[PDB]
Amino acid sequence: RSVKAGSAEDAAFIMKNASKVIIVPGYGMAVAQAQHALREMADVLKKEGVEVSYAIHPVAGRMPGHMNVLLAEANVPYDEVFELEEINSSFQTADVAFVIGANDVTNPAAKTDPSSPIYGMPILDVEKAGTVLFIKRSMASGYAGVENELFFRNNTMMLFGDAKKMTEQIVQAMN
Numbered sequence: 001r002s003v004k005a006g007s008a009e010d011a012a013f014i015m016k017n018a019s020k021v022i023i024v025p026g027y028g029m030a031v032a033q034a035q036h037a038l039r040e041m042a043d044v045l046k047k048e049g050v051e052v053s054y055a056i057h058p059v060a061g062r063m064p065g066h067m068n069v070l071l072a073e074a075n076v077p078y079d080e081v082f083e084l085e086e087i088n089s090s091f092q093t094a095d096v097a098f099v100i101g102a103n104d105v106t107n108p109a110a111k112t113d114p115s116s117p118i119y120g121m122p123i124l125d126v127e128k129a130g131t132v133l134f135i136k137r138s139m140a141s142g143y144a145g146v147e148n149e150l151f152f153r154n155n156t157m158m159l160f161g162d163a164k165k166m167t168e169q170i171v172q173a174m175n
């Protein structure tokens with residue numbers, strides 16, 4: 001087994017109702033729907049009084065300064081957005097981590113065990129937050145998709161489905 005239960009229905013808590021998280025725009029996120037989903041989410045939801053930064057290497061997806069496009073091109077802000085080495089703060093208070101579409105960018109293997117097929121680095125210690133929403137089908141390859149057992153601790157994880165189903169059910173249609 002792993003360590004989760006409700007899919008996006010859970011986001012509503014770590015997303016549309018989680019004092020402190022970090023939208024981690026991975027490959028799907030912006031190219032999934034998050035781009036405009038986490039966009040309205042980071043707004044209609046940040047207004048509730050919840051924080052939302054972005055936990056991802058400054059390259060989690062296609063180009064480098066691109067995942068910030070879904071944040072900018074959509075509407076979400078990048079001032080509360082931390083690339084990588086500075087994520088030590090985002091996840092320092094985030095009692096969650098909406099890890100949307102990321103995959104090898106969060107490979108906590110470096111945080112858990114270097115045995116991984118790669119070497120990892122200062123990823124975005126996402127599992128090291130309250131909950132975590134790794135939204136994607138399942139066999140997410142990415143640049144590595146290796147060691148990522150992060151989905152085995154306190155309700156922190158991945159929510160099978162498309163990043164478009166992520167914010168659509170939580171911030172766009174919980175119940």
Ligand SMILES: NC(=O)c1ccc[n+]([C@@H]2O[C@H](COP(=O)([O-])OP(=O)(O)OC[C@H]3O[C@@H](n4cnc5c(N)ncnc54)[C@H](OP(=O)(O)O)[C@@H]3O)[C@@H](O)[C@H]2O)c1
Pocket residue numbers: 026027028029031032057058059060061062063064101102103104105106135136137138139140141142143144145162163
């Ligand atoms: N950006 C650059 O210029 C650059 C340059 C050199 C190295 N890198 C490195 O490349 C890595 C990138 O990490 P990352 O997490 O962003 O990358 P990935 O691991 O490259 O991420 C791809 C992930 O997004 C998902 N995905 C793809 N299409 C999707 C879709 N249509 N809808 C929903 N999900 C989709 C995939 O899983 P699912 O199919 O399960 O969704 C996949 O696992 C980093 O280690 C980085 O340092 C980047």
